[PDB]
Design a binder for this molecule. Sequence first.
Ligand SMILES: COc1cc2ncnc(Nc3cccc(Cl)c3F)c2cc1OC(=O)N1CCN(C)C[C@H]1C
Length: 273
Amino acid sequence: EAPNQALLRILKETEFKKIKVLGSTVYKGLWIPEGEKVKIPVAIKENKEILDEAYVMASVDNPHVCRLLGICLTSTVQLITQLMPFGCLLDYVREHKDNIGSQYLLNWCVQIAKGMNYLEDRRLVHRDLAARNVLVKTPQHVKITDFGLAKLVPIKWMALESILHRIYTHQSDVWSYGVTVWELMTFGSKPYDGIPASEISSILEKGERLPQPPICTIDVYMIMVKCWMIDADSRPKFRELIIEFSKMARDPQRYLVIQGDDMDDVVDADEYL
Ligand SMILES: COc1cc2ncnc(Nc3cccc(Cl)c3F)c2cc1OC(=O)N1CCN(C)C[C@H]1C
């Protein structure tokens, strides 16, 4: 009901340099706003769908969500955004599975919940929350991205009511939050590995759920289980998840049990306002 006064910035292609490939296309590069004396590390993602994505990314502004810097309209529609140098959190947990402590895991849970609470504040349902869609700015700071599915298909992350009746709500996102947390606490295991997507709705209806990760106390796993209640309004709210994971982050070893616990003018997008 409130007007969306977000600014869509159209960026000249001549302001982008050092373009190199990250995956397939998404590239890294440098954005030098003309007449600004600043170099900004960026990712660039290479039509109604990409622009629906650009619409949502330009309309968010929160420390735990990735925002659109602008678009470039040359041969292709390119989305320009802050470079998140450590890549996706799923690949990060898998590679550093032996250097990741309780403080980091719980802090990431708090930050993802903050991002999702903000989206709820903005009446946005993400619909694709997953560890592959959280990026790592630094090991201390992650942010939610990939809004090409958000509104005002990944079966193994979806609430049962979404699989059965294509019903999507903030509380359906809470279910996906629970699955994302399970991915982190297993250092990136695949949910329901080897179980075909077609059989997922059947398993969930019988009462089966993802199992307790070895490092998780019952305190942490019980929160995960609450996100998978059949009654959507019985699941936690994101603002409650922030609270509970914050409490646990003050004493992380009580809640997770882990054995062993081009440079002069560079400005990060978070300091470029
Ligand atoms: C350095 O790594 C990355 C940093 C990113 N910073 C921002 N956004 C990124 N994506 C993005 C998402 C939505 C909208 C826009 Cl506009 C985006 F630009 C980033 C992607 C990155 O790359 C990966 O995570 N990799 C890991 C290696 N695989 C091969 C896969 C490949 C995907």
